[PDB]
């Protein structure tokens, strides 16, 4: 607040702490759905497409985690197979209009670097070992989200470049190149080569 | 040093007052401080009434530095303090030094006639 | 005074009624008015100025006080007896170590061993008068500082300098203190104070490898600080506490100082012009550590200047060539080498200003003085390789390159060695150009370097000096060839044609070339490995910002409580690097974020000694830039709180007094560099063109303006404290610059600045009693 | 030459009891002056305010209350006119940008910090655009002939032809720091010492070269010590900034080898490259308490590279401020001839204020005085304009004056 009001306003908002405490589903950050492709989305899991925050009724002083971007929920849903329509129903994507949704793009990049880390752990003790399954699902999911311009290719690639490097993540770079080959081979003729 | 308007206002006072400068407090850097007196058939209670006349006299009406330490411990002095303070409250803005002296005198007289 | 006497009589009568009674609150009220009157500074000052006019009533005051104290002390109260004790102390009112003497002694030991004792005695008497130090604790801090600095010294020549500093400079300091002030009883007390500290003395004895307290007590007996009976019972105590083939360095130094005097008096005359005797004596000198012992003794005892004059005059005598055959000139060239190499070693160790003549009537400045002036690298001196000093002729330099390409000289019978040494720079310049064009092979370069470094070693030093200047100017990729020249000039010995004393000249020359090349070989990572000898060199971390260095060293100096030698060297390099303003401002910031009384007082007692690196410039920054910025800024003066603020006011007044009453070579160079207009900096609405008078006048104008204004806050408490320690710290003058309106205003804001300043004449009481009015 | 206006503070001058500080001044491409002054009334933040004065409406002076705890050393506009770097003693480079595209509301979200070390030189990185003006083609009736781009390379190109934006600052220790602004809000910082021998840098300056190398000149004020030179190369190794320095040929200074009376002028007081992107010529200014010497030097090769002097003034008063031109003239021999014949002198002048009132507009190449303006108190900061027809200047009072040079 302003330095002249000070305590007079701040303590006031603190007395609205119990009301916000009434209107909070406890453990809402750690509750996760079971992803069904059926549609008819329950509106509990909808996030804000601008900032990945839960949409909150009122202007109360809610608990400090409810003002954070819910990346855990979105990463859990993107890691599941056939969670294509559910991510659109969460982030309000519509497919009649292309938008370049940025937080979706950053979450997809972080999913790729997480897959690269978990491939660089060993990937050789267990041949299947959930790694190549993850890379196949990453291929399918990322093809859809870059193809309809909900995310974009070159910002994704150069942000991916900024996350790698120094990290020294080199054992499964062939898989990452394969996924990029899926995008390029899918859409080289539609866009200019400078992309 | 001292502005000419203050000198003229002093020269044209009623002989009841014996205004003088103030070398006691920190002065000669800000405003002009005065301990004048009360000498008349009335009462000489608390003669100093320290008055700080700021520079550029035809503005920023002078303020009386309050001293409640001496005006207490006595009923008459408490009454004169109360009435003179109320009369300063009723005084119009941009008042002069002669106005404060006259309202001080008439407030003392009101305290005399009341008790 | 009469009302105080009546109040004392009221307490006496009421206490007598209390004794006869045993609610008697009359004693409580009487004592309350006693402490309420006497608690004010106005009233105690008024009673002190009332003292003078009415003598012998004070006697009755104190006798009534004594009877009062008896009758109250018999009938004690859980609260009133403490009150009566407090009021009695008030009517009568009408340690730790001393880190500053420690750090001043350790600073003078570390930086200028060669400084005169009078400056040190003046500074120590100053410090003793600022903070009022008893004489036994003062001399104890001197000895403790000396021994601690000896123990913490690195092995090598610094241990020699510290042994010479304790055993030869400090007794002369105590002698001049005995002159310039019952000293034997105090120094004996301080010696018993010291002899309690057995672990310090045993650590020192392990480094000394002898009883260095015995040598101290015999030395202070020789100087006359101590009586002989005191010396003998102190040595008895020390032996009793001690019970629970090579000579040590202290005996060598104490016997080597008379050899310094007698070597002066015998080599005035060139051993009656016998240069072979000179060669024998100087070859004994270059035998291990003997030169360093003589130099440490001569530096600690003030005779380094005469020693340098003697070797310089010997050098001038052996410059030219007498008509000779070979085994007389082969002696004369060796005399040139020994005198030159020892003069370079002196100038690299004890500074260059002992080599200077400081007045040469006539143009006949010697060869070594000009060579050192224009051609030798020092710490703050970087040289121009194409200065006109390095380009003497074209005639002689072709004769010299033909001379170096002839064979092993063979013509040393007449060389005029000053001309040769001045010409080597142009010679190796042409050699370098020949090698850069490729006309010269590497193998002929080896021949030329052998002809330089073989017969006479000073030629290698002159060539390496020019090479260091020339490599410092070059770029990165252009350097590669010229560094090889140093690798051949500073390489291991050329053999089988050496004149005499070759290995010792090689050892001294390797030291000189280390200290010449070190900076350039730091710029590019190049290891030459000439042969620790540079113990305090390259101290800063390579990448860390320099405030972290400053705050870490000041944190460690506070948590120890004294300033190390290494810490003194890093503080010097940071003062040279970040400048005075940055240094003083950051140390004062680190003061002002302390919250304890103990740590603030210790930090101030250390920071005075740290600022004694360049006291004068630090006072100009402190009273001119830091303090007006803290007093004028309205947001800043919350930092001027009670605990750090009193300490800061103390440090400012100590700095002002010590700068008024009135030191390192970097600081001398940098203040000679500095240009500033203090008349323009401080426009001001004795000389008054001396900048310190201008800063002091400006500061006192600021103080009067702060005291006179409204809005009293912490800054007003600061200027009150500043004026109070100006009063208390003075003997009598910094306060000559005070405006006379401050006399009026200071007792308008309250006291002691009147009652001390008046000097108490019968008319002086009238002005005193007048001042104590208003508030 | 002539005085257009003099803008003074009203009653807010008479700084008392606290000494003066050096001022900064920066004229942008859009005509906005950013400058600091020593107001010193009831606060020291009145010496930490950055005044923005639009030159068409000077009465309206905006005053950014910068949160700089020590005194502002350097101000620096962008290559455009849209951002302003400001750095003070004790680190803290702040990058002010406009708020809501108003020239009256500035706010900094981005900055660097090398704590405790005073910034002594500061520069934006070069974006590779450089054009040259051919005065002899003034009638040539096509703008491609008059103004032509000169194939300059930007330091740190990133994935395309596009330069990164960022700054490089040089501290009073040996430290240099580079901060690179991403197209996103991220900022990469790196500090590294200039050379291994860490030493005082009391004056410093930054130029750029073709090839994307920064060239930074350091001096320690002593005027008998060399003015050293370093080549800095920026890179983005992996994902972070990476600085590669290399020593260049240093120079000493004449008036020290004068040998008649060499001791005078013991302080180098201004070090300036002749223009940023003109890294081969250097203007130095040695000064005593009363007199001074400016000198121009050049790197020109034959030791391959070697600093040789071009010219020097005879003896002056003490130079209080120095302003170098910004108009990028083509500087070769035919254009010198035609600009001497047709008297075109906008890009060939430096302005030298002095400690008396006078101001000298002096030639670039051979420093002979072209004009003299007597003030009828000295200019503590000067700046020429981008077309170099007017120079702005802050005095040793509150006065800010704009002079027109014909």
Swiss-Prot record, chain A:
Domain of life: Eukaryota
Subcellular location: Nucleus
Family under the similarity heading: Belongs to the Mediator complex subunit 23 family.
Function, as annotated: Required for transcriptional activation subsequent to the assembly of the pre-initiation complex. Component of the Mediator complex, a coactivator involved in the regulated transcription of nearly all RNA polymerase II-dependent genes. Mediator functions as a bridge to convey information from gene-specific regulatory proteins to the basal RNA polymerase II transcription machinery.
Subunit structure: Interacts with ELK1. Component of the Mediator complex, which is composed of MED1, MED4, MED6, MED7, MED8, MED9, MED10, MED11, MED12, MED13, MED13L, MED14, MED15, MED16, MED17, MED18, MED19, MED20, MED21, MED22, MED23, MED24, MED25, MED26, MED27, MED29, MED30, MED31, CCNC, CDK8 and CDC2L6/CDK11. The MED12, MED13, CCNC and CDK8 subunits form a distinct module termed the CDK8 module. Mediator containing the CDK8 module is less active than Mediator lacking this module in supporting transcriptional activation.
UniProt disease link: Intellectual developmental disorder, autosomal recessive 18, with or without epilepsy: A disorder characterized by significantly below average general intellectual functioning associated with impairments in adaptive behavior and manifested during the developmental period.
Included range, full protein: 197 to 391 of 1368
UniProtKB/Swiss-Prot annotation, chain B:
Signal sequence interval, chain numbering: none
Protein modification: Ubiquitinated by TRIM11, leading to proteasomal degradation.
Superkingdom in the source lineage: Eukaryota
Localization of this protein: Cytoplasm; Nucleus
Tissue: Expressed in all tissues examined, including heart, brain, lung, spleen, thymus, pancreas, blood leukocyte and placenta. However, the level of expression varied, with highest expression in the placenta and peripheral blood and lowest in the pancreas and kidney.
Induction (free text): By 12-O-tetradecanoylphorbol-13-acetate (TPA).
Similarity field: Belongs to the Mediator complex subunit 15 family.
Function: Component of the Mediator complex, a coactivator involved in the regulated transcription of nearly all RNA polymerase II-dependent genes. Mediator functions as a bridge to convey information from gene-specific regulatory proteins to the basal RNA polymerase II transcription machinery. Mediator is recruited to promoters by direct interactions with regulatory proteins and serves as a scaffold for the assembly of a functional preinitiation complex with RNA polymerase II and the general transcription factors. Required for cholesterol-dependent gene regulation.
Name of the protein this chain belongs to: Mediator of RNA polymerase II transcription subunit 15
Species of the source: Homo sapiens (Human)
Parent sequence residues shown: 673 to 787 of 788
UniProtKB/Swiss-Prot annotation, chain C:
GO BP term, example: RNA polymerase II preinitiation complex assembly
Sequence motif LXXLL motif 4, residues: 400-404
Tissue-wise expression: Ubiquitous. Abundant in skeletal muscle, heart and placenta.
Keyword Transmembrane helix: no
CC per GO annotation: core mediator complex; mediator complex; nucleoplasm; nucleus
Motif position, LXXLL motif 3: 291-295
Motif LXXLL motif 1: chain residues: 4-8
Chief location category: nucleus
Pfam families: Med24_N
LXXLL motif 2, short sequence motif: residues: 197-201
GO molecular function per UniProt: nuclear thyroid hormone receptor binding; nuclear vitamin D receptor binding; transcription coactivator activity; transcription coregulator activity
Compartments, record wording: Nucleus
Phosphoprotein recorded as keyword: yes
Motif (LXXLL motif 5): 627-631
Keywords, ordered alphabetically: Activator, Nucleus, Phosphoprotein, Repeat, Transcription, Transcription regulation
Function comment: Component of the Mediator complex, a coactivator involved in the regulated transcription of nearly all RNA polymerase II-dependent genes. Mediator functions as a bridge to convey information from gene-specific regulatory proteins to the basal RNA polymerase II transcription machinery. Mediator is recruited to promoters by direct interactions with regulatory proteins and serves as a scaffold for the assembly of a functional preinitiation complex with RNA polymerase II and the general transcription factors.
Family to which the UniProt record says this protein belongs: Belongs to the Mediator complex subunit 24 family.
Name of the protein this chain belongs to: Mediator of RNA polymerase II transcription subunit 24
Curated annotation (Swiss-Prot), chain D:
Placement of WD repeats on the sequence: 9-59, 60-107, 108-153, 154-191, 192-245, 246-302, 303-376, 377-406
Entry GO CC: core mediator complex; mediator complex; membrane; nucleoplasm; nucleus
Protein localization: Nucleus
Superkingdom, taxonomy of origin: Eukaryota
Keyword Repeat: yes
Primary subcellular site in the record, as a coarse category: nucleus
UniProt keyword Membrane, yes or no: no
GO biological process entries: positive regulation of DNA-templated transcription; positive regulation of transcription elongation by RNA polymerase II; positive regulation of transcription initiation by RNA polymerase II; regulation of transcription by RNA polymerase II; RNA polymerase II preinitiation complex assembly; transcription by RNA polymerase II
Entry's transmembrane regions: none
Keyword annotations of the record: Activator, Nucleus, Repeat, Transcription, Transcription regulation, WD repeat
Gene Ontology MF term list: nuclear thyroid hormone receptor binding; nuclear vitamin D receptor binding; transcription coactivator activity
Function in brief: Component of the Mediator complex, a coactivator involved in the regulated transcription of nearly all RNA polymerase II-dependent genes. Mediator functions as a bridge to convey information from gene-specific regulatory proteins to the basal RNA polymerase II transcription machinery. Mediator is recruited to promoters by direct interactions with regulatory proteins and serves as a scaffold for the assembly of a functional preinitiation complex with RNA polymerase II and the general transcription factors.
Family per record: Belongs to the Mediator complex subunit 16 family.
Gene responsible for this protein: MED16
């Amino acid at each position: 607040p302003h330095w002249l009001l000070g305590n007079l306003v701040s303590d006031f908002v603190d007395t609205f702490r119990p009301t916000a405490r009434i209107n909070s589903i406890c453990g809402r950050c750690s509750l996760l759905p079971v992803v069904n492709n059926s549609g008819a989305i329950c509106n509990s899991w909808k996030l804000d497409p601008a900032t990945l925050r839960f949409p909150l009724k009122g202007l109360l002083p809610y608990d400090k985690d409810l003002f954070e971007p819910q990346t855990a929920l979105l990463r859990y849903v993107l890691e599941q197979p056939y969670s294509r329509d559910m991510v659109c129903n969460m982030l309000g994507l519509n497919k009649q209009h292309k938008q370049r949704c940025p937080v979706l793009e950053d979450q997809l990049v972080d999913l790729v670097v997480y897959a690269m880390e978990r491939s660089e752990t060993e990937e050789k003790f267990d041949d299947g070992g959930t790694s190549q399954l993850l890379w196949q699902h990453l291929s399918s999911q990322l093809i859809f989200f870059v193809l309809f311009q909900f995310a974009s290719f070159p910002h994704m690639v150069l942000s991916l470049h900024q996350k790698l490097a120094g990290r020294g993540l080199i054992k499964g770079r062939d898989h990452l190149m394969w996924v990029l080959l899926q995008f390029i081979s899918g859409s080289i003729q539609k866009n200019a080569l400078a992309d | 040093s001292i502005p000419s308007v203050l000198q003229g206002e002093v020269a044209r006072l009623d002989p009841k007052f014996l205004v003088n400068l103030d070398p006691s407090h920190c002065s000669n850097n800000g405003t002009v401080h005065l301990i004048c007196k009360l000498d008349d058939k009335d009462l000489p209670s608390v003669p100093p009434l320290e008055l700080s006349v700021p520079a550029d006299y035809p503005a920023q009406s002078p303020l009386w530095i309050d001293r409640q330490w001496q005006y207490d411990a006595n009923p008459f002095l408490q009454s004169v303090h109360r009435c003179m303070t109320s009369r300063l409250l009723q005084l119009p803005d941009k008042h002069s030094v002669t106005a404060l002296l006259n309202t001080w005198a008439q407030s003392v007289h009101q305290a005399c006639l009341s008790a | 005074l009469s009302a105080l006497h009546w109040l004392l009589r009221c307490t006496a009568a009421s206490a007598e009624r209390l004794r006869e009674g045993l609610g008697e609150k009359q004693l409580a009220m009487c004592l309350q008015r006693l402490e309420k009157t006497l608690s004010s500074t106005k009233n105690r000052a008024l009673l002190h100025i009332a003292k003078l006019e009415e003598a012998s009533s004070w006697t009755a005051i104190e006798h009534s006080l004594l009877k009062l104290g008896e009758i109250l002390a018999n009938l004690s109260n859980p609260q009133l007896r403490s009150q009566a004790e407090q009021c009695g102390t008030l009517i009568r009112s009408i340690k730790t170590g001393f880190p500053t003497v420690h750090a001043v002694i350790l600073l003078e030991g570390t930086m200028n061993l060669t400084g005169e004792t009078q400056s040190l005695v003046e500074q120590l008497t100053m410090v003793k008068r600022m903070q009022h130090i008893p004489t036994p604790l003062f001399v104890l801090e001197i000895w403790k500082a000396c021994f601690v600095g000896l123990i913490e010294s690195p092995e090598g020549t610094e241990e020699l300098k510290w042994t010479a500093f304790t055993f030869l400079k400090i007794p002369q300091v105590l002698v001049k203190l005995k002159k310039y002030s019952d000293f034997t009883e105090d120094v004996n007390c301080a010696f018993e104070f010291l002899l309690k500290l057995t672990p310090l003395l045993d650590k020192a004895d392990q480094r000394c490898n002898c009883d260095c307290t015995n040598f101290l007590l015999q030395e202070c007996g020789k100087q006359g600080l101590l009586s002989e009976a005191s010396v003998n019972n102190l040595m008895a105590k020390r032996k009793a506490d001690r019970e629970h083939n090579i000579q040590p360095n202290i005996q060598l130094i104490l016997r080597a100082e008379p050899t310094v005097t007698n070597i002066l008096k015998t080599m005035d005359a060139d051993h009656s012009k016998s240069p072979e005797g000179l060669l024998g004596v100087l070859g004994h000198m270059l035998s291990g550590k003997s030169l360093d012992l003589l130099l440490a003794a001569a530096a600690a005892t003030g005779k380094l200047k005469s020693f340098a004059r003697k070797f310089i005059n010997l050098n001038e005598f052996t410059t030219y060539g007498s008509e000779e055959s070979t085994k007389p000139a082969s002696v004369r060239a060796l005399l040139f080498d020994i005198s030159f190499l020892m003069l370079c070693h002196v100038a690299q160790t004890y500074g260059s200003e002992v080599i200077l003549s400081e007045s040469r009537t006539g143009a006949e400045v010697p060869f070594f003085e000009t060579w050192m002036q224009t051609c030798m690298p020092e710490e703050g001196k970087i040289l121009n390789p194409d200065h006109p000093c390095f380009r003497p002729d074209s005639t002689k330099v072709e004769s010299l390159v033909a001379l170096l390409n002839n064979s092993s000289e063979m013509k040393l019978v007449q060389m005029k060695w000053h001309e040769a040494c001045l010409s080597i720079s142009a010679a190796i310049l042409e050699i370098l150009n020949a090698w850069e064009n490729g006309v010269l092979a590497f193998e002929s370069i080896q021949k030329i370097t052998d002809n330089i470094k073989g017969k006479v070693c000073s030629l290698a030093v002159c060539a390496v000096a020019w090479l260091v200047a020339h490599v410092r100017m070059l770029g990165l990729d252009e350097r590669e060839k010229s560094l090889q020249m140093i690798r051949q000039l500073a390489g291991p010995l050329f053999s089988e044609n050496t004149l005499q004393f070759y290995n010792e000249r090689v050892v001294i020359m390797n030291s000189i070339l280390e200290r010449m090349c070190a900076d350039v070989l730091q710029q590019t990572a190049t290891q030459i490995k000439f042969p620790d000898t540079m113990p305090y060199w390259n101290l800063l971390p390579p990448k860390r910002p320099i405030k972290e260095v400053l705050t870490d060293i000041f944190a460690k100096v506070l948590e120890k409580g004294w300033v190390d030698s290494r810490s003194i060297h890093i503080f010097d390099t940071l003062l040279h690097m970040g400048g005075v303003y940055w240094f003083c401002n950051n140390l004062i910031k680190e003061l002002l974020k302390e919250t304890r009384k103990e740590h603030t007082l210790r930090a101030v007692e250390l920071l005075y000694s740290i600022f004694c690196l360049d006291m004068q410039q630090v006072t100009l920054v402190l009273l001119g830039h830091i303090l007006p910025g803290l007093l004028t800024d309205s947001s800043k003066w919350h930092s001027l709180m009670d605990p750090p603020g009193t300490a800061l006011a103390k440090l400012a007044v100590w700095c002002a007094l010590s700068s008024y009453s009135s030191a390192s070579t970097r600081q001398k160079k940098r203040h000679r560099e500095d240009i500033e207009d203090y008349i323009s900096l401080f426009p001001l609405d004795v000389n008054m063109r001396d900048p310190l008078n201008r800063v002091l006048a400006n500061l006192f104008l600021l103080i009067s303006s702060i005291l006179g204004s409204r809005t009293a806050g912490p800054h007003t408490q600061f200027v009150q404290w500043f004026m109070e320690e100006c009063v208390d710290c003075l003997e009598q003058s910094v306060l000559q610059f005070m405006p006379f309106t401050t006399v009026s205003e200071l007792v308008k804001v309250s006291k002691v600045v009147l009652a001390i300043t008046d000097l108490s004449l019968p008319l002086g009481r009238q002005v005193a009693a007048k001042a104590i009015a208003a508030l | 030459m002539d005085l257009a206006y003099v803008c003074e503070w009203e009653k807010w001058s008479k700084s008392t009891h606290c000494p003066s500080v050096p001022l900064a001044c920066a004229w942008s491409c859009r005509n906005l002056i950013a400058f600091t002054m020593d107001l010193r009334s009831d606060d020291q933040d009145l010496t930490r305010m950055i005044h923005i004065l639009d030159t068409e409406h000077p009465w309206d002076l905006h005053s950014i209350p910068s949160e700089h705890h020590e005194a502002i050393t350097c101000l620096e506009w962008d290559q455009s006119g849209s951002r302003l770097l400001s750095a003070d003693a004790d680190g803290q480079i702040k990058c002010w940008s406009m708020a809501d595209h108003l020239a009256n509301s500035w706010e900094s979200s981005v900055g660097s910090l090398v704590e405790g070390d005073p910034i002594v030189a500061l520069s934006w990185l070069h974006n590779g655009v450089k054009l040259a003006l051919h005065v002899e083609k003034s009638g040539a009736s096509s703008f491609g002939e008059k103004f032509s781009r000169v194939k300059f390379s930007p330091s740190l190109t990133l994935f395309g032809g596009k330069p990164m934006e960022g700054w490089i600052a040089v501290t009073v220790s040996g430290l240099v720091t580079v901060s690179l602004l991403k197209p996103s809000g991220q900022v990469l910082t790196s500090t590294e010492s200039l050379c291994r021998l860490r030493g005082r840098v009391a004056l410093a300056d930054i130029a750029f070269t073709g090839g994307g190398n920064i060239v930074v000149a350091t001096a320690d004020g002593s005027s008998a010590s060399p003015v050293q030179f370093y080549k800095v190369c920026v890179s983005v190794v992996s994902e972070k900034c990476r600085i590669d320095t290399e020593i260049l040929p240093s120079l000493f200074m004449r008036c020290t080898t004068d040998l008649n009376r060499k001791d005078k002028f013991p302080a180098i007081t201004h070090l300036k490259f002749l223009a940023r992107d003109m890294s081969e010529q250097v203007l130095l200014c040695a000064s005593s308490q009363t007199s001074s010497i400016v000198e121009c030097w050049s790197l020109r090769k034959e030791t391959i590279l070697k600093w040789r002097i071009l010219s020097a003034t005879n003896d002056l008063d003490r130079v209080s401020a120095v302003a170098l031109p910004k108009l990028p003239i083509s500087l070769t021999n035919t254009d010198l001839k035609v600009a001497s014949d047709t008297q075109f002198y906008p890009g060939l002048g430096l302005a030298l204020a002095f400690h008396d009132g006078s101001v000298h507009i002096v030639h670039r190449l051979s420093l002979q005085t072209m004009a003299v303006f007597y003030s009828s108190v000295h200019l503590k900061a000067m700046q020429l304009s981008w077309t170099s027809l007017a120079l702005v200047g802050i005095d040793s009072h509150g006065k800010l004056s704009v002079l027109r040079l014909s």
